[PDB]
Design an enzyme around this catalytic site. Structure first.
Site, PDB file in Angstrom:
ATOM      1  N   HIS A 183      24.750  25.017  30.325  1.00 47.38           N
ATOM      2  CA  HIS A 183      25.942  24.415  29.749  1.00 47.38           C
ATOM      3  C   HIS A 183      26.575  25.403  28.819  1.00 47.38           C
ATOM      4  O   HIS A 183      27.643  25.130  28.306  1.00 47.38           O
ATOM      5  CB  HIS A 183      25.661  23.064  29.060  1.00 47.38           C
ATOM      6  CG  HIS A 183      25.140  23.184  27.656  1.00 47.38           C
ATOM      7  ND1 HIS A 183      23.816  22.965  27.330  1.00 47.38           N
ATOM      8  CD2 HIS A 183      25.769  23.479  26.491  1.00 47.38           C
ATOM      9  CE1 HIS A 183      23.653  23.127  26.031  1.00 47.38           C
ATOM     10  NE2 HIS A 183      24.822  23.438  25.499  1.00 47.38           N
TER      11      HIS A 183
ATOM     12  N   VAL B  11      27.546  40.922  10.273  1.00 51.16           N
ATOM     13  CA  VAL B  11      27.387  42.231   9.638  1.00 51.16           C
ATOM     14  C   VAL B  11      26.607  43.144  10.576  1.00 51.16           C
ATOM     15  O   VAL B  11      25.639  42.709  11.174  1.00 51.16           O
ATOM     16  CB  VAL B  11      26.676  42.117   8.244  1.00 51.16           C
ATOM     17  CG1 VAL B  11      26.402  43.494   7.630  1.00 51.16           C
ATOM     18  CG2 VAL B  11      27.475  41.229   7.274  1.00 51.16           C
TER      19      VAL B  11
ATOM     20  N   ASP C 264      19.370  22.181  32.983  1.00 51.22           N
ATOM     21  CA  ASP C 264      20.149  22.936  32.036  1.00 51.22           C
ATOM     22  C   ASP C 264      19.444  24.219  31.671  1.00 51.22           C
ATOM     23  O   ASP C 264      18.856  24.338  30.581  1.00 51.22           O
ATOM     24  CB  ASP C 264      20.413  22.119  30.782  1.00 51.22           C
ATOM     25  CG  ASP C 264      21.559  22.665  29.985  1.00 51.22           C
ATOM     26  OD1 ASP C 264      22.234  23.618  30.465  1.00 51.22           O
ATOM     27  OD2 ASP C 264      21.778  22.138  28.877  1.00 51.22           O
TER      28      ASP C 264
ATOM     29  N   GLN D 225      24.927  21.917  17.646  1.00 48.82           N
ATOM     30  CA  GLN D 225      25.811  22.736  18.509  1.00 48.82           C
ATOM     31  C   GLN D 225      25.724  24.183  18.011  1.00 48.82           C
ATOM     32  O   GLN D 225      25.626  24.420  16.810  1.00 48.82           O
ATOM     33  CB  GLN D 225      27.303  22.315  18.600  1.00 48.82           C
ATOM     34  CG  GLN D 225      27.715  20.979  18.102  1.00 48.82           C
ATOM     35  CD  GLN D 225      27.253  19.815  18.978  1.00 48.82           C
ATOM     36  OE1 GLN D 225      26.615  18.875  18.470  1.00 48.82           O
ATOM     37  NE2 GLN D 225      27.583  19.853  20.292  1.00 48.82           N
ATOM     38  N   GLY D 226      25.751  25.133  18.936  1.00 46.13           N
ATOM     39  CA  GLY D 226      25.637  26.512  18.536  1.00 46.13           C
ATOM     40  C   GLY D 226      24.201  27.019  18.574  1.00 46.13           C
ATOM     41  O   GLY D 226      23.975  28.233  18.498  1.00 46.13           O
TER      42      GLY D 226
ATOM     43  N   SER E 113      22.538  25.819  21.036  1.00 44.64           N
ATOM     44  CA  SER E 113      22.516  25.586  22.477  1.00 44.64           C
ATOM     45  C   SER E 113      22.067  26.850  23.164  1.00 44.64           C
ATOM     46  O   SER E 113      22.585  27.953  22.880  1.00 44.64           O
ATOM     47  CB  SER E 113      23.915  25.221  23.007  1.00 44.64           C
ATOM     48  OG  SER E 113      24.420  23.983  22.489  1.00 44.64           O
ATOM     49  N   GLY E 114      21.087  26.695  24.046  1.00 49.92           N
ATOM     50  CA  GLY E 114      20.687  27.774  24.920  1.00 49.92           C
ATOM     51  C   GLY E 114      19.567  28.573  24.331  1.00 49.92           C
ATOM     52  O   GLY E 114      18.976  29.384  25.012  1.00 49.92           O
TER      53      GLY E 114
HETATM   54 CA   LIG Z   1      24.395  41.732  12.864  1.00 55.57          CA
END
Ligand SMILES: [Ca+2]
Length: 223
Positions: free
Chosen positions: A40, A57, A84, A174-175, A177-178
């Protein structure tokens, strides 16, 4: 990660960031040329960013490598999120060191109660929005099938497990994910879905990697 802590720079060397202009998902490096993430999270024009702590950074340990080939699992269903999982091959091999390391595929599924490390750059708030610049971590147990299927009735397949806290307060989001769910040096899960984040009786649901080792193997072998 809601309710976790700051990992510390490079303390989770197998964790990738997927960048397509910005961070949009996590992943796990599993050998020098391959990354596993959730289906997804599929996009075109993925750059895999390895050795990351602060995603805003340049700290000196990063390797930035573009995706050569993306492979969404052959049976990914996006309405149910069953299967998934997704492989990405890198245009060139990552230099493996202690800041950029791969994670073993499981040889057998973990049982409920097994403690795992889940990490990522996902939202850190249960209500509202805040995305960290540094990798966040969380230790969470696997939940029994029963209690998982009670949290999300009719929604959990044998390719999913729940992990986390039924009282809520600590979850991926969220974020994340995976990204990885690592238990005792093995990749057991992939951050997949969940209703809200860290809500009571709605723990995190993860792709059960132990079902896909065959497919991953395999796909690596012929590609
Ligand atoms: Ca970095």
């Amino acid at each position: 990660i809601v309710g976790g802590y700051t990992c510390g720079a490079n303390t989770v060397p197998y964790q990738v960031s997927l960048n397509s202009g910005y961070h949009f998902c996590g992943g796990s490096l599993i050998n020098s040329q391959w990354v596993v993430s959730a289906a997804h999270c599929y996009k075109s024009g993925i750059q895999v960013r390895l050795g990351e702590d602060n995603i805003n950074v340049v700290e000196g340990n990063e390797q930035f490598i573009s995706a050569s080939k993306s492979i969404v699992h052959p049976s990914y269903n996006s309405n149910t999120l069953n299967n998934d999982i997704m492989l990405i091959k890198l245009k060139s091999a990552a230099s493996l060191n202690s800041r950029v390391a791969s994670i073993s595929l499981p040889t057998s599924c973990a049982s409920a109660g097994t403690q795992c490390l889940i990490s990522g750059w996902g939202n850190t708030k249960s209500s509202g929005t805040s995305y960290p610049d540094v990798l966040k971590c969380l230790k969470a147990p696997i939940l029994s099938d029963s209690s998982c299927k009670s949290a999300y009735p009719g929604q959990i397949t044998s390719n999913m497990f729940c992990a986390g806290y039924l009282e809520g307060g600590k979850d991926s989001c969220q974020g994340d994910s995976g990204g990885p769910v690592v238990c005792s040096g093995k990749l057991q899960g992939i951050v997949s879905w969940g209703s809200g984040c860290a809500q009571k009786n709605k723990p995190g649901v993860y792709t059960k990697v132990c079902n896909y080792v065959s497919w991953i193997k395999q796909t690596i072998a012929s590609n």
